[PDB]
Amino acid sequence: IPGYTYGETENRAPFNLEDLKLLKEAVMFTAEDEEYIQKAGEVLEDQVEEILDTWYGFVGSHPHLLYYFTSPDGTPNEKYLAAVRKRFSRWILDTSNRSYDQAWLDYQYEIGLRHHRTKKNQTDNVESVPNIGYRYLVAFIYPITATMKPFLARKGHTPEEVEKMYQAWFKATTLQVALWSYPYVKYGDF
Amino acid sequence: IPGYTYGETENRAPFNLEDLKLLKEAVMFTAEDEEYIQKAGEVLEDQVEEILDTWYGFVGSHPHLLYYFTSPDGTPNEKYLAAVRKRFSRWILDTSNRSYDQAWLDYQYEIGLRHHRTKKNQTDNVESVPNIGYRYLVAFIYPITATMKPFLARKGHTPEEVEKMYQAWFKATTLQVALWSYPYVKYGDF
Ligand code: HEM
Ligand code: HEM
C-alpha cells in the first residue's frame, strides 16, 4: 500500500503508553472494548468497499470538505483520492486488529502530521491545500461513527451486540482524533 | 448564575454563522436534529441534579481528571467545583434550548477560553491548574454522550425517539468541542 508506513515511521510519537492509558480512561475504553472492536472488524471486513463508497460519498457531497483533496484549480485530485483511499481502508482494519501499543501510537502521530500542514500532500507528492482545518477533524468523529453504524447490523447480530461494537468504534475514533490534535495544538497546550 | 455571561461576552467569536453552517454539515446536523435536541432538553430538564452527580462522579473518580479542579497543593477546590457545576448545569439546557446563532457562537468562544490557559480560573477567581490539555476536551466527547444516554430514555419515549435525541446530543457535543479548539490550535491551523 503506497505511503503506508505503520510500524516503520521515521519518528517515535511524543506520547507513550502512560499517556495512552490516561486517555483510554477519559474515553471509557476498556478490555471489553478491545474485544468488541475486534468483533466490529470481523463484521466490517468483507463490507469495506461499500464502506469506502459511503465514506467518500459523504466527503464528496460537500464542496468545503472535498476541498481538502482538490488541485489548485478547485477540482478533485483523483490520484490523491485513490491513494489515500487505500490507506483509509487499511486504517479500518488497523483500528480493529492492531494492539494499541507504542507502534500504534507512533502511527497515530504520523496520521495527525499528515492531516496537518507538517506533512500533508507529502506522502503522495501532490499539489493540494496545505492544511485541513482542525475544526473538521473533530467534526468528523460523528460521521465516521454514523457511517459504520449501518454496516455493523448487517451480519446479523442482536441490537445489544451491535450497540457494543458501535460504542467501541465511537470510543476508538475519539481517542485517535484526540491524539491527532498534537501537531495542531500550541506547544504545551496538548 | 455567577460567571455565566451568555449574550453578554466581552468579544465577538472569530467564527461566524457561515462557519457554523459548514461545521453543522460536517457533523450531519440538520433541521431534524433541532427538533430532537429541543426534545432532549425537555426530557433532561427534570434530571439535571442526577446528571451532574453522574458527570462529576466520573470526573471525580479519576485522579488525572479531578486534577483540573485542584488547588496547587493537590486537593480538590470545592468552591471551584460547585461554581462551575452551576454553569455546566445551564449548558445542558443551553444546548437543548438556545438557537445556535451568533450569540451562541460567541458563548462557544468563551467556553473554549475558559478551558484553555487564556481564561481558566478567572471566572471564579480561583487558583488551580493553568490549562486543561486539549487531548481531554476531545476525549470527553465520549463520556458526555454516554452520560446523557440513560437519562434520555427515562421519560418513556420510543427507542427510535431516544436514539434520535442521543444522536442529536452526540452531534451537538461534537460541534461544540470543535469550536472550543480555537484558543488551543496554532494560529491559522483551525
Ligand atoms: C474522524 C476523523 C478522521 C479520520 C478517522 C480520518 C482518516 C484518515 C486516514 C486513515 C487517512 C490515511 C492515513 C495514512 O496516511 O495512513 C487520512 C488521510 C487524509 N484525510 Fe482523513 N480522517 C479524518 C478527518 C479528515 C477530514 C476532516 C478531512 C477533510 C476532508 C480528511 C481528509 C483527508 C485527507 C485530504 C488525507 C490525505 C492527507 C495527506 O496528504 O497525507 N480527513 N484520513
Ligand atoms: C465534551 C467536553 C467538555 C464539555 C462539554 C465541558 C463542559 C463544560 C462547561 C459547560 C463549562 C462551564 C462553561 C461556562 O463557564 O459557562 C466547563 C468548564 C470547565 N470544565 Fe469542562 N467541558 C468539557 C471538557 C472538559 C475536560 C476534559 C475537563 C477536565 C477535567 C473539564 C473541566 C472543566 C473545568 C476545570 C472548567 C472551569 C474552567 C474555568 O476555570 O472557567 N472540562 N466545562
Numbering used by the authors:
A (entry chain A), B (entry chain B): 6 to 195
Give sentences from the paper.
Protoglobin (Pgb) is a recently discovered haem-protein with distinct structural and functional features that make it unique within the globin superfamily. The MaPgb* structure can be considered as an expanded version of the 3/3 helical sandwich typical of “classical” globins (i.e. Mb), with an additional N-terminal extension, built by a 20-residue loop, followed by the Z-helix, which precedes the globin-fold conserved A-helix. Residues belonging to the Z-helix contribute to formation of the Pgb homodimer, which is centered on the intermolecular four-helix bundle built by the G- and H-helices of the two subunits. Thus, in Pgb the access of diatomic ligands, such as O2, CO, and NO, to the haem is granted by two orthogonal apolar tunnels that reach the haem distal region from entry sites at the B/G and B/E helix interfaces.
The size and plasticity of the MaPgb*(III) distal site suggest that the protein could bind haem ligands bigger than “classical” diatomic species. Therefore, a triatomic molecule such as azide was tested. The structure of the MaPgb*(III)-azide complex was solved at 1.8 Å resolution (two MaPgb* molecules in the asymmetric unit) and refined to a final R-factor of 18.9% and R-free of 25.6%. The MaPgb*(III)-azide structure is almost superimposable in its backbone to that of MaPgb*(III)-cyanide (rms deviation values calculated for 190 Cα atom pairs ranging between 0.26 and 0.39 Å), and the dimeric quaternary structure is preserved. The linear azide anionic ligand is coordinated to the haem-Fe(III) atom with a coordination bond of 1.97 Å for the A chain, and 1.99 Å for the B chain, and is oriented towards tunnel 2, with the Fe–N1–N3 angles of 125° and 114°, respectively. Contrary to the MaPgb*(III)-cyanide adduct, the haem-Fe(III)-bound azide is stabilized by only one H-bond, provided by the Tyr(61)B10 OH group (2.71 Å for chain A, and 2.72 Å for chain B). The Trp(60)B9 side chain, however, adopts the same orientation in the MaPgb*(III)-cyanide and in the MaPgb*(III)-azide complexes. Thus, the absence of a stabilizing H-bond interaction between azide and the Trp(60)B9 side chain can only be ascribed to the triatomic nature of the ligand, which positions its N3 atom ∼4 Å away from the Nε2 atom of Trp(60)B9. Only Tyr(61)B10 is slightly shifted (about 0.9 Å at the OH group) due to the different size of the bound ligand (azide vs cyanide). Furthermore, similarly to the MaPgb*(III)-cyanide structure, the Cα-backbone at the 150–154 region diverges significantly relative to that of the ligand-free MaPgb*(III) and MaPgb*(II)-O2 structures, with structural heterogeneity at the Thr(150)G12 side chain.
